[PDB]
Amino acid sequence: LMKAVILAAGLGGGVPKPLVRVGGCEIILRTMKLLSPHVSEFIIVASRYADDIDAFLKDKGFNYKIVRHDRPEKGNGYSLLVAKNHVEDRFILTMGDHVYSQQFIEKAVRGEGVIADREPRFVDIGEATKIRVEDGRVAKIGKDLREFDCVDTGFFVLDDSIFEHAEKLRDREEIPLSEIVKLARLPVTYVDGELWMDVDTKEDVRRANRALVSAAVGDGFISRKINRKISTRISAAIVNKVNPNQMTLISFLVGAFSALASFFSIPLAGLLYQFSSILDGCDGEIARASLKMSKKGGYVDSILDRFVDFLFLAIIALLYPKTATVAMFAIFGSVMVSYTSEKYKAEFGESIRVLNYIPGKRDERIFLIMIFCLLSAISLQWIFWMFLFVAAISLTRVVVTLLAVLVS
Amino acid sequence: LMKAVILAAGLGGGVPKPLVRVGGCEIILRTMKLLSPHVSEFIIVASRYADDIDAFLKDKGFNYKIVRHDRPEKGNGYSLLVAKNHVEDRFILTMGDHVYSQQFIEKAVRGEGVIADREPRFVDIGEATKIRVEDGRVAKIGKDLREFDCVDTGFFVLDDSIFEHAEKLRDREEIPLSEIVKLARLPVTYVDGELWMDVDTKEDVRRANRALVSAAVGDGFISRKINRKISTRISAAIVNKVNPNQMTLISFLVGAFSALASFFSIPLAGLLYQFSSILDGCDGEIARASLKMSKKGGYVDSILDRFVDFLFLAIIALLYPKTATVAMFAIFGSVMVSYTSEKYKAEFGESIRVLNYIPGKRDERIFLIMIFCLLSAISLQWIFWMFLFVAAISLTRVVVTLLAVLVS
C-alpha cells in the first residue's frame, strides 16, 4: 500500500470545497475513507484553508499531514512540486473537490498514470479535461480538445519520475497540472461509466446526493417495485440534513404513532404503517451513501422494527379481544421471520443462499396489513382474517426456512 | 506445524482400543481432531487391526497414512523404529489408547520431549509409568519406581536424535518404549492436573465419559444451581449412545408434549416443561464432549426452543381467552429476549459484555412458569399473573439490553 496526495488549493457556499458536504459527508473525508485501506499515509496540500482542513481532520483517526504553500494562484502543478519530499516510489494524486464512488476507487488504485473515463455519466462533457490517447499514452490534454478518446477524472497514480518533468516548469508564472501530464507521456488507465464528479454549484451537490443515494440501494416485491422508489427520493433530499441515527428515531416514531393511530380510524393506521415501512429503509440508504454505517445503528433499528410490528398488531387486539387468540400466532410468526434470518447470520456468519418466492418479508407483510386495515372500515370480519393471514405466511416462511437449513 | 505419530499395537469389548468409543467419539479420532490444526500429516503404526483403522479413517477428511508391521509383541519401541523414514526434524508421538482433553493437548504440543504430569487426577497412580527427574531431564522411568517426581502421560514431542538411541536396541527381543526414553536423556515437559487417561476397562470408559462431559459445561441461576447438575449426569450416561441431533429431537418432543400436556392437568405440564428445560442443555453437552459441534444443530435447536416456549404459553391461552391479551406480551417478550442476544452476535460478531442481574433467561423464566402452573390448581387467578410476570421480566431485560447497547 502506497501514499496518497490530495490537492486542495482553490477555489472557494462560503465553505471550502474539500469541506463542502456531499451525501452526508464532506468531499475530502469521503476520499480518505475510501482510499484508507489502500493507503499508508495521506498528504494534503492546502493554502488559505489549511488550518480549517487540519482542524477538521484531527480526530478522524487518519494518518495524515498538511503541506502548506502561500502561492495557490500559480496552478495545480506547483501544488504537486511542493509535495515532492513527502513521497517515495509510487503514490496517488487526487483532487480535493472531486467526489468518487467506492466502485470507482477500487478500479482506480489498481491503475497507473492518468485515470481516464471514456464515457462520463455524471459530469459536463462541455466543461471537462479532455484527453487524446496514442499508444495507451497521453498524446494531448485540455478542456477544449476537439478530438478526445476519454476524459480526465482528476485521479492519478504516479511515481518519482513525475517530478523531473514538473521541475522543468518551476520558473513559470502559472503551472497547470494539465501541461505536466503531456511532458511525462503518462500511461492512460481506463475506468469508464463509474460515479465521479467535481463539485462546484449547490446544484452539483444535489445531483451528487441523488447519485450517491441511488447507488446506495433482502428487498421483497413491495420494496423493489414501490418502497425503494419513494424512499430514495426522500433520502437524497435529506441526505446531508439528517444523520442515520436521527432517521432511525423518526421512522420509529412514525411507526409507533401509526400503531397508536388505531384508537381512531384503523384504516388510517394501516396507511401510516405502510408509510413507516417506506421510511424504515431511509437510515440505511443514508448511512450507506454517507459511509456512516455502524453496527450499533443496525442493531437498534431492528429492535425498534420488531417493537413497532408488535405494537401495531397488539393494539388492534386490545380493542378486539375475540381476535387476540389469533393475534398470538401473527405476533409470534412476525418476530420468528426476523429471528430465523438473524439466528442464521450469527451461527453461519453470513446472510441469505435460498429461494425467495415464499411470502413474506416485512415489506410485503405490512403492505397486506394496510389493505386488510382498509377492508376493516367495511367489515370488522376482515380483521380476524388479517391476523390469520399474517400468521399463515409468517410461520410458513419460518417453517420452510427451518426445513431448508435441516438439509445441508 | 509438524507431523504426529500415533502408535496402535495391542492390546484388544472386542473392538480395538483406538476404535473404542469414549464420550461419543472413538479414541484415535478424538486425538487427531485435537492435533489437526497443529499437525501437517498423521502417521499411524498398526499391526493386526491396521485394515480396520484404515477403513475407518478414509472419509474423516484427515491427512494420514498407515505404517504396518506384523511383529507387535516386540514392544512399543519397535513401533517407533519402523516409523523412522516417514518423519523429519521435530514430530509428535502419542498412544492410540489414550484420551486427551483439548486443554491438555494445547499445553502439550508446545512442550518438548516427555510430557509429564506431577499430579494425575484421572488415572491410577498404582498402575502408571512413573518418572524421576534430574536436571529437567529423565533420570529414570518405569511402572514400579519408588521415588518419582511425575507420571508419563503417553504424549511425546521428539526429534531425529531419538532414532539413534532406538536403533541401539534393534536386536532385542522385546523393546519397550520406556527404556528408550532413558538412553536419550529426554527433556521433561510439565502438564499437570489436566484431563488424560488410558482406556482399558468398560469402567474406564464411563469414568472418562463423565470426565469429558463434566469438562464440557450464558447459564442463569436455575441452570447453574439446578439444571446443569441434572443434565450432565444424563449426558454422561447417554454420551456414546445418543448423538447431538437425536438429543435435539428428544428434548423438542418432550417440550412439545409438555405444552400439549395442558389439555389435562396444567400443573403437570409445568413440571414436564421444567424437565424439558433440563434436557435442552444435553445436546450441547454431548456435542462439546464428542467434538461433534455443528452450526446446523445450534440453529435448529434454537428454533425448536422458540416454538416450544410459544406452544406452551399459547396453548394455555387457547383454553383461557381472558388471559390471551396478556399472553401476547408474554409471548412477544419471550422471543425478544432471544432475538436481542442473537441480533447482537450477528451484528457485532460475538456473544454477551454486560451484567446478568436482570431476570430472566429461558432457564429462570421456565422455572417460574412451572411454579405458576402449580399455583394454577389452587386458583386460576395465578395464570393471568404468570403471563404478566413473564411479559414483565422479558420486556424489561429486552429494554435494558437495548438501552445498554445505545451507549457504546
Ligand SMILES: [Mg+2]
Ligand atoms: Mg430500517
Ligand SMILES: [Mg+2]
Ligand atoms: Mg438446547
